[PDB]
Protein backbone atom coordinates (compact mmCIF):
# COMPACT_ATOMS: atom_id res chain seq x y z
CA UNK A 1 0.00 0.00 0.00
CA UNK A 2 1.35 3.42 -1.14
CA UNK A 3 3.16 5.52 1.51
CA UNK A 4 0.66 8.39 1.60
CA UNK A 5 -2.31 9.70 3.59
CA UNK A 6 -4.91 7.12 4.63
CA UNK A 7 -8.68 7.56 4.79
CA UNK A 8 -11.23 5.28 6.40
CA UNK A 9 -14.99 5.48 5.86
CA UNK A 10 -17.81 2.90 5.83
CA UNK A 11 -21.42 3.28 4.70
CA UNK A 12 -22.69 0.99 7.49
CA UNK A 13 -21.82 3.79 9.96
CA UNK A 14 -24.67 5.73 8.26
CA UNK A 15 -27.11 3.18 9.76
CA UNK A 16 -26.57 4.43 13.32
CA UNK A 17 -29.68 6.54 12.67
CA UNK A 18 -33.08 6.93 14.30
CA UNK A 19 -35.91 5.36 12.27
CA UNK A 20 -37.63 8.81 12.00
CA UNK A 21 -34.58 9.74 9.84
CA UNK A 22 -34.46 13.45 10.85
CA UNK A 23 -31.31 15.58 11.22
CA UNK A 24 -33.30 18.19 13.23
CA UNK A 25 -34.26 16.02 16.19
CA UNK A 26 -30.81 14.29 16.51
CA UNK A 27 -27.71 16.46 15.79
CA UNK A 28 -25.32 13.46 15.66
CA UNK A 29 -26.64 12.23 12.27
CA UNK A 30 -25.50 10.21 9.22
CA UNK A 31 -25.18 13.30 7.02
CA UNK A 32 -22.11 14.41 9.01
CA UNK A 33 -19.83 11.69 7.55
CA UNK A 34 -21.76 11.44 4.25
CA UNK A 35 -21.12 15.12 3.51
CA UNK A 36 -17.41 15.00 4.50
CA UNK A 37 -16.83 11.96 2.30
CA UNK A 38 -18.37 13.55 -0.82
CA UNK A 39 -16.46 16.81 -0.09
CA UNK A 40 -13.16 14.89 -0.17
CA UNK A 41 -14.34 13.18 -3.40
CA UNK A 42 -15.38 16.52 -5.03
CA UNK A 43 -12.08 18.25 -4.18
CA UNK A 44 -10.02 15.33 -5.63
CA UNK A 45 -8.45 14.62 -2.21
CA UNK A 46 -9.89 11.08 -1.98
CA UNK A 47 -8.01 10.19 -5.21
CA UNK A 48 -4.68 11.31 -3.69
CA UNK A 49 -5.32 9.15 -0.56
CA UNK A 50 -5.22 5.42 0.14
CA UNK A 51 -8.80 4.51 1.15
CA UNK A 52 -8.48 1.51 3.51
CA UNK A 53 -11.10 -1.10 4.37
CA UNK A 54 -12.45 -1.03 7.94
CA UNK A 55 -13.93 -3.71 10.16
CA UNK A 56 -15.89 -4.19 13.35
CA UNK A 57 -13.93 -4.15 16.59
CA UNK A 58 -14.09 -7.45 18.45
CA UNK A 59 -15.68 -7.43 21.90
CA UNK A 60 -12.15 -8.29 23.22
CA UNK A 61 -10.71 -5.10 21.61
CA UNK A 62 -13.50 -2.98 23.10
CA UNK A 63 -12.73 -4.48 26.52
CA UNK A 64 -9.27 -2.81 26.51
CA UNK A 65 -11.25 0.30 27.58
CA UNK A 66 -14.80 -0.78 28.54
CA UNK A 67 -16.27 -3.23 30.99
CA UNK A 68 -17.58 -6.54 29.57
CA UNK A 69 -21.17 -5.62 30.47
CA UNK A 70 -20.94 -2.31 28.57
CA UNK A 71 -19.48 -3.98 25.46
CA UNK A 72 -22.23 -6.64 25.48
CA UNK A 73 -24.97 -4.04 25.98
CA UNK A 74 -24.02 -1.71 23.06
CA UNK A 75 -21.91 -4.18 20.95
CA UNK A 76 -24.44 -6.99 20.32
CA UNK A 77 -28.19 -6.97 19.52
CA UNK A 78 -30.12 -10.22 20.16
CA UNK A 79 -33.96 -10.23 20.33
CA UNK A 80 -30.54 7.49 19.60
CA UNK A 81 -30.24 3.73 19.39
CA UNK A 82 -31.05 1.82 16.21
CA UNK A 83 -32.19 -1.61 17.37
CA UNK A 84 -30.81 -3.23 14.16
CA UNK A 85 -27.60 -1.37 13.13
CA UNK A 86 -26.17 0.77 16.01
CA UNK A 87 -24.19 -2.04 17.69
CA UNK A 88 -22.49 -2.86 14.40
CA UNK A 89 -22.01 0.79 13.50
CA UNK A 90 -20.45 1.70 16.90
CA UNK A 91 -18.08 -1.26 16.54
CA UNK A 92 -17.21 -0.22 12.97
CA UNK A 93 -16.22 3.28 14.14
CA UNK A 94 -13.75 1.75 16.61
CA UNK A 95 -12.40 -0.80 14.13
CA UNK A 96 -12.00 1.74 11.32
CA UNK A 97 -9.96 3.98 13.63
CA UNK A 98 -7.92 0.96 14.84
CA UNK A 99 -7.16 -0.20 11.28
CA UNK A 100 -5.98 3.23 10.13
CA UNK A 101 -3.98 3.74 13.37
CA UNK A 102 -2.03 0.48 12.91
CA UNK A 103 -1.20 1.18 9.24
CA UNK A 104 0.29 4.52 10.30
CA UNK A 105 2.03 3.17 13.46
CA UNK A 106 3.71 0.36 11.46
CA UNK A 107 4.95 2.74 8.68
CA UNK A 108 2.60 1.38 5.96
CA UNK A 109 0.88 4.82 5.63
CA UNK A 110 2.33 8.31 6.32
CA UNK A 111 -0.66 9.55 8.33
CA UNK A 112 -4.48 9.38 8.25
CA UNK A 113 -7.98 10.76 8.77
CA UNK A 114 -10.87 8.60 10.06
CA UNK A 115 -14.28 9.76 8.83
CA UNK A 116 -16.23 7.97 11.57
CA UNK A 117 -19.37 8.13 13.66
CA UNK A 118 -20.70 7.78 16.26
CA UNK A 119 -18.05 9.81 18.17
CA UNK A 120 -16.07 8.32 21.08
CA UNK A 121 -14.44 10.78 23.45
CA UNK A 122 -17.26 11.07 26.05
CA UNK A 123 -17.67 7.27 26.47
CA UNK A 124 -16.42 6.12 29.87
CA UNK A 125 -15.55 2.58 31.08
CA UNK A 126 -19.22 1.59 31.68
CA UNK A 127 -21.12 4.74 30.66
CA UNK A 128 -22.17 6.13 27.29
CA UNK A 129 -22.75 9.90 27.05
CA UNK A 130 -22.71 12.84 24.66
CA UNK A 131 -23.77 10.63 21.72
CA UNK A 132 -20.72 8.33 22.34
CA UNK A 133 -20.83 4.60 23.16
CA UNK A 134 -17.27 3.28 22.69
CA UNK A 135 -14.15 5.44 22.83
CA UNK A 136 -12.61 4.67 19.44
CA UNK A 137 -9.42 6.69 20.01
CA UNK A 138 -8.79 5.25 23.51
CA UNK A 139 -9.29 1.68 22.24
CA UNK A 140 -6.84 2.33 19.37
CA UNK A 141 -4.22 3.68 21.83
CA UNK A 142 -4.62 0.65 24.19
CA UNK A 143 -4.21 -1.71 21.24
CA UNK A 144 -1.02 0.13 20.21
CA UNK A 145 0.25 -0.49 23.76
CA UNK A 146 -0.77 -4.18 23.87
CA UNK A 147 0.02 -5.26 20.26
CA UNK A 148 2.82 -2.94 18.98
CA UNK A 149 4.72 -1.99 22.19
CA UNK A 150 4.42 1.73 21.39
CA UNK A 151 6.12 3.43 24.35
CA UNK A 152 4.64 6.96 24.13
CA UNK A 153 1.30 8.05 22.63
CA UNK A 154 0.11 11.66 22.42
CA UNK A 155 -3.68 12.08 22.30
CA UNK A 156 -4.64 15.63 21.28
CA UNK A 157 -8.36 16.43 21.67
CA UNK A 158 -9.31 19.65 19.87
CA UNK A 159 -13.04 19.00 19.93
CA UNK A 160 -14.50 22.04 21.76
CA UNK A 161 -15.88 19.77 24.54
CA UNK A 162 -13.71 17.92 27.09
CA UNK A 163 -13.10 14.23 26.27
CA UNK A 164 -13.92 12.95 29.78
CA UNK A 165 -13.83 9.34 28.53
CA UNK A 166 -10.31 9.59 27.13
CA UNK A 167 -9.08 11.42 30.28
CA UNK A 168 -10.49 8.57 32.37
CA UNK A 169 -8.90 5.88 30.18
CA UNK A 170 -5.31 7.09 30.69
CA UNK A 171 -5.44 9.11 33.92
CA UNK A 172 -2.90 6.90 35.76
CA UNK A 173 -0.79 6.01 32.67
CA UNK A 174 2.43 8.03 32.01
CA UNK A 175 2.88 6.36 28.59
CA UNK A 176 -0.18 8.14 27.13
CA UNK A 177 -0.27 11.96 27.25
CA UNK A 178 -3.89 13.18 27.01
CA UNK A 179 -4.01 16.81 25.85
CA UNK A 180 -7.43 18.54 25.56
CA UNK A 181 -8.15 22.03 24.24
CA UNK A 182 -11.76 22.71 25.23
CA UNK A 183 -14.29 25.32 26.31
CA UNK A 184 -14.35 24.96 30.10
CA UNK A 185 -15.75 28.25 31.56
CA UNK A 186 -14.86 27.25 35.16
CA UNK A 187 -16.82 23.97 34.91
CA UNK A 188 -20.04 25.56 33.60
CA UNK A 189 -20.09 24.22 30.03
CA UNK A 190 -20.64 20.70 28.59
CA UNK A 191 -19.81 18.24 29.97
CA UNK A 192 -18.50 20.18 32.99
CA UNK A 193 -15.27 18.23 33.46
CA UNK A 194 -11.66 19.01 32.49
CA UNK A 195 -10.21 21.41 35.02
CA UNK A 196 -6.60 22.57 34.53
CA UNK A 197 -5.72 21.06 37.94
CA UNK A 198 -6.60 17.52 36.76
CA UNK A 199 -3.02 16.44 35.98
CA UNK A 200 -3.34 12.63 36.31
CA UNK A 201 -2.93 10.26 39.24
CA UNK A 202 -0.35 7.75 40.54
CA UNK A 203 2.42 7.18 37.94
CA UNK A 204 0.29 9.29 35.53
CA UNK A 205 0.78 12.58 37.45
CA UNK A 206 1.69 15.37 34.99
CA UNK A 207 0.57 13.47 31.86
CA UNK A 208 -3.00 14.83 31.64
CA UNK A 209 -3.11 18.37 30.21
CA UNK A 210 -6.44 20.23 30.19
CA UNK A 211 -5.97 23.41 28.11
CA UNK A 212 -9.21 24.75 29.54
CA UNK A 213 -10.44 28.03 28.08
CA UNK A 214 -12.40 30.11 30.66
CA UNK A 215 -14.28 33.45 30.46
CA UNK A 216 -17.13 32.40 28.17
CA UNK A 217 -17.89 34.14 24.90
CA UNK A 218 -16.61 37.61 25.94
CA UNK A 219 -15.05 37.69 23.42
CA UNK A 220 -15.37 34.17 21.94
CA UNK A 221 -12.21 32.18 21.24
CA UNK A 222 -10.77 32.24 17.72
CA UNK A 223 -7.74 31.43 15.56
CA UNK A 224 -5.30 33.65 17.45
CA UNK A 225 -6.26 32.09 20.82
CA UNK A 226 -5.78 28.46 19.65
CA UNK A 227 -2.56 29.35 17.79
CA UNK A 228 -1.26 30.92 21.01
CA UNK A 229 -2.35 27.82 23.01
CA UNK A 230 -0.43 25.69 20.50
CA UNK A 231 2.68 27.90 20.72
CA UNK A 232 2.80 28.31 24.54
CA UNK A 233 1.33 25.04 25.92
CA UNK A 234 0.54 22.26 23.42
CA UNK A 235 3.76 22.11 21.34
CA UNK A 236 6.28 22.71 24.12
CA UNK A 237 4.76 19.86 26.20
CA UNK A 238 4.16 17.64 23.14
CA UNK A 239 7.79 18.16 21.97
CA UNK A 240 9.26 17.44 25.41
CA UNK A 241 7.15 14.25 25.66
CA UNK A 242 8.41 13.23 22.20
CA UNK A 243 5.64 10.80 21.23
CA UNK A 244 6.08 7.77 19.00
CA UNK A 245 2.52 8.19 17.61
CA UNK A 246 -0.02 11.06 17.67
CA UNK A 247 -3.78 10.48 17.83
CA UNK A 248 -6.12 13.42 17.39
CA UNK A 249 -9.67 13.43 18.71
CA UNK A 250 -10.65 15.77 15.89
CA UNK A 251 -14.00 17.38 16.59
CA UNK A 252 -14.71 20.45 14.41
CA UNK A 253 -17.30 22.11 16.69
CA UNK A 254 -14.90 24.95 17.62
CA UNK A 255 -15.39 26.13 14.01
CA UNK A 256 -17.46 29.29 13.34
CA UNK A 257 -21.20 28.51 13.07
CA UNK A 258 -21.77 26.20 16.05
CA UNK A 259 -24.11 27.92 18.50
CA UNK A 260 -23.81 27.19 22.22
CA UNK A 261 -23.89 24.57 23.71
CA UNK A 262 -22.58 22.71 20.61
CA UNK A 263 -19.81 25.32 20.35
CA UNK A 264 -19.77 29.13 20.64
CA UNK A 265 -16.28 29.71 19.13
CA UNK A 266 -14.98 31.38 15.94
CA UNK A 267 -12.17 29.18 14.60
CA UNK A 268 -11.77 29.10 10.86
CA UNK A 269 -11.61 25.78 9.03
CA UNK A 270 -8.22 26.92 7.67
CA UNK A 271 -6.81 27.11 11.21
CA UNK A 272 -7.30 23.33 11.63
CA UNK A 273 -5.08 22.82 8.58
CA UNK A 274 -2.41 24.85 10.38
CA UNK A 275 -2.84 22.95 13.69
CA UNK A 276 -2.62 19.58 11.85
CA UNK A 277 0.58 20.74 10.10
CA UNK A 278 2.10 21.64 13.49
CA UNK A 279 1.29 18.16 14.93
CA UNK A 280 2.77 16.47 11.82
CA UNK A 281 6.21 17.70 12.95
CA UNK A 282 6.01 15.25 15.90
CA UNK A 283 6.58 11.50 16.04
CA UNK A 284 8.07 11.31 12.50
CA UNK A 285 4.70 12.42 11.08
CA UNK A 286 2.84 9.38 12.46
CA UNK A 287 -0.48 11.08 13.13
CA UNK A 288 -4.10 9.94 12.78
CA UNK A 289 -7.13 12.26 13.10
CA UNK A 290 -10.47 10.73 14.05
CA UNK A 291 -13.72 12.72 13.74
CA UNK A 292 -15.42 13.44 17.06
CA UNK A 293 -17.95 16.33 17.24
CA UNK A 294 -18.84 19.04 14.75
CA UNK A 295 -22.39 19.49 13.51
CA UNK A 296 -22.61 22.27 10.87
CA UNK A 297 -22.06 20.54 7.50
CA UNK A 298 -20.13 23.29 5.68
CA UNK A 299 -17.87 23.89 8.72
CA UNK A 300 -16.90 20.23 9.20
CA UNK A 301 -16.49 19.67 5.45
CA UNK A 302 -14.25 22.77 5.21
CA UNK A 303 -12.19 21.78 8.28
CA UNK A 304 -11.87 18.17 7.05
CA UNK A 305 -10.70 19.42 3.65
CA UNK A 306 -8.04 21.59 5.32
CA UNK A 307 -6.85 18.74 7.59
CA UNK A 308 -6.65 16.13 4.80
CA UNK A 309 -4.93 18.70 2.53
CA UNK A 310 -2.41 19.44 5.29
CA UNK A 311 -1.89 15.68 5.84
CA UNK A 312 -1.08 15.28 2.11
CA UNK A 313 1.63 18.00 2.29
CA UNK A 314 -0.14 20.72 0.24
CA UNK A 315 -0.40 24.31 1.61
CA UNK A 316 -2.93 27.15 2.18
CA UNK A 317 -0.98 38.72 13.65
CA UNK A 318 -3.67 39.23 16.35
CA UNK A 319 -3.01 39.09 20.10
CA UNK A 320 -4.97 36.50 22.12
CA UNK A 321 -7.79 37.94 24.27
CA UNK A 322 -7.32 38.49 28.03
CA UNK A 323 -9.53 35.48 28.91
CA UNK A 324 -7.36 33.19 26.74
CA UNK A 325 -4.12 34.66 28.23
CA UNK A 326 -5.47 34.09 31.77
CA UNK A 327 -6.54 30.52 30.84
CA UNK A 328 -3.12 29.59 29.36
CA UNK A 329 -1.35 31.16 32.37
CA UNK A 330 -3.40 29.00 34.77
CA UNK A 331 -2.41 25.85 32.83
CA UNK A 332 1.29 26.79 32.44
CA UNK A 333 1.33 27.60 36.16
CA UNK A 334 -0.01 24.15 37.12
CA UNK A 335 2.14 22.31 34.56
CA UNK A 336 5.39 24.20 35.42
CA UNK A 337 5.64 21.56 38.18
CA UNK A 338 5.92 18.65 35.67
CA UNK A 339 7.42 19.91 32.39
CA UNK A 340 10.90 21.42 31.90
CA UNK A 341 9.67 23.71 29.08
CA UNK A 342 7.31 25.44 31.58
CA UNK A 343 9.58 25.40 34.75
CA UNK A 344 9.86 29.20 34.88
CA UNK A 345 6.18 30.03 34.16
C1 LIG B 1 -27.22 20.50 27.82
C2 LIG B 1 -26.34 19.84 26.79
N3 LIG B 1 -25.39 20.55 26.15
C4 LIG B 1 -24.59 19.99 25.23
C5 LIG B 1 -24.70 18.62 24.91
C6 LIG B 1 -23.82 17.95 23.88
C7 LIG B 1 -22.97 18.69 23.04
C8 LIG B 1 -22.16 18.07 22.10
C9 LIG B 1 -22.15 16.68 21.95
C10 LIG B 1 -21.31 15.99 20.93
C11 LIG B 1 -19.91 16.56 20.94
O12 LIG B 1 -19.56 17.40 20.12
N13 LIG B 1 -19.06 16.11 21.87
O14 LIG B 1 -17.76 16.60 21.93
C15 LIG B 1 -21.86 16.04 19.54
C16 LIG B 1 -22.96 16.83 19.16
C17 LIG B 1 -23.40 16.85 17.84
C18 LIG B 1 -22.76 16.07 16.88
C19 LIG B 1 -21.66 15.30 17.25
C20 LIG B 1 -21.22 15.28 18.56
F21 LIG B 1 -20.15 14.52 18.87
C22 LIG B 1 -22.99 15.94 22.77
C23 LIG B 1 -23.80 16.56 23.71
C24 LIG B 1 -25.70 17.91 25.62
N25 LIG B 1 -26.48 18.53 26.53
NA1 LIG C 1 -1.83 9.68 30.97
ZN1 LIG D 1 -35.77 9.97 16.08
ZN1 LIG E 1 -17.76 18.39 20.90
Q: What are the structural domains, with CATH classification, of the chain?
A: 1-345 (3.40.800.20)
CA gap 113, 225 in Å, rounded? 25
Dist. CA 82 → ligand 3 center (Å): 9
Question: Does residue 295's CB lie within 6 angstroms of at least one atom of ligand 1?
Answer: yes
User: Which residues, in sequence order, are CB contacts of 185 under 8 Å at separation 6+?
Assistant: 213, 214, 215, 216
Q: Is residue 130 within 6 Å of ligand 1 at its C-beta?
A: yes
Question: What technique determined this structure?
Answer: X-ray
CA–CA separation, 292 and 253 (whole Å): 9
Q: Please provide residue 3's backbone torsions phi and psi, each rounded to the nearest 5 degrees.
A: -80, 80
Can you tell me the distance from the alpha carbon of 345 to that of 336, in angstroms, rounded to the nearest whole number? 6
Say how many Å lie between the CA of residue 166 and the centre of ligand 2: 9
Ligand 1, atom 23, residue with closest C-alpha: 130
- Residue with CA at minimum distance from ligand 1 atom 12: 293
Nearest one of 115, 331, 99 to 236, comparing CA atoms: 331
Ligand positioned closest to the Cα atom of 120: 1
* DSSP type of residue 325: H
Looking at the CA of 290, name the nearest ligand.
1
DSSP at 39: H
Nearest to 226 by CA among 173, 279, 181, 285: 181
On whether the CB atoms of residues 342 and 236 are closer than 8 A, the answer is: yes
Q: Would you say 128 and 226 are in contact if contact means Cβ atoms under 8 Å apart?
A: no
Q: Does residue 27 line the site of ligand 1, with CB under 6 A?
A: yes
Nearest-CA residue for ligand 1 atom 9 is 130
Task: State in Å: Cα 143 to ligand 4 middle.
Answer: 24
Q: How far is the C-alpha of 99 from the C-alpha of 83, rounded, in Å?
A: 26
**Calpha distance 292→136 (Å, rounded):** 10
51 annotated as ligand-binding: no
Mutate which of 17, 190, 250 for ligand 1 pocket (most atoms within 8 A of beta carbon): 190
Determine if residue 66 is labeled as part of a ligand binding site: no
Distance 202 CA to ligand 1 centre (A): 31
With 0-12 CB in 10 A as exposed, 13-18 as middle and 19+ as buried, what is 253?
A: buried
Query: How buried is residue 136: exposed, middle or buried, by Cβ count under 10 Å (0-12/13-18/19+)?
Result: buried
**According to the annotation, is 18 in a ligand binding site?**
yes
Which residues does the annotation mark as catalytic?
122
Give the residue whose CA is nearest to atom 3 of ligand 1.
Answer: 261
User: Which ligand sits nearest to residue 80's alpha carbon?
Assistant: 3
Nearest CA among 304, 170, 176, 192 for reference residue 244: 176
Please indicate whether residue 119, judged by its CB atom, sits closer than 6 Å to ligand 1. yes
For 11-34, b/e burial (b = at least 16 CB within 10 A) is eebbebbeeeeeeeeeebbbebbb
Q: Kind and range of the H or E element at 308?
A: helix 297-311
Pocket lining: 28 vs ligand 1, CB cutoff 6 Å: yes
- Residue 103 to residue 122: CA distance in whole angstroms: 25
Enumerate residues with CB within 5 Å of ligand 3 (an ion).
18, 20
β-bridge pairing 208-213 and 245-250: unpaired
| Beta strands 176-183; 153-157: pairing state | parallel
Tell me the sheet residues that pair with 132.
Answer: 129
Q: Compute the distance from residue 204 Cα to the ligand 4 centre, in Å.
A: 25
How many CB atoms within 10 Å of residue 336? 14
Q: Is the CB of 159 under 6 A from ligand 1?
A: yes
* Alpha-carbon span 194 to 186, nearest angstrom: 9
Does residue 191 have a cis peptide bond before it, meaning omega lies within 30 degrees of 0?
Answer: yes
Amino acid sequence: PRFTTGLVYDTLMLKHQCTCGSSSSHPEHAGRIQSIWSRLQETGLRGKCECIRGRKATLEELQTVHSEAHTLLYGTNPLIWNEVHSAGAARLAVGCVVELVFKVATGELKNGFAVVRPPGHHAEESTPMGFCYFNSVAVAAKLLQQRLSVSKILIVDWDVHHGNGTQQAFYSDPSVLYMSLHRYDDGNFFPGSGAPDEVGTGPGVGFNVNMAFTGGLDPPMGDAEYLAAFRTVVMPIASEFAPDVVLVSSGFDAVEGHPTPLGGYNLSARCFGYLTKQLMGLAGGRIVLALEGGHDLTAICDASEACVSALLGNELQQRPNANAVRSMEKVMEIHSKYWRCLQRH
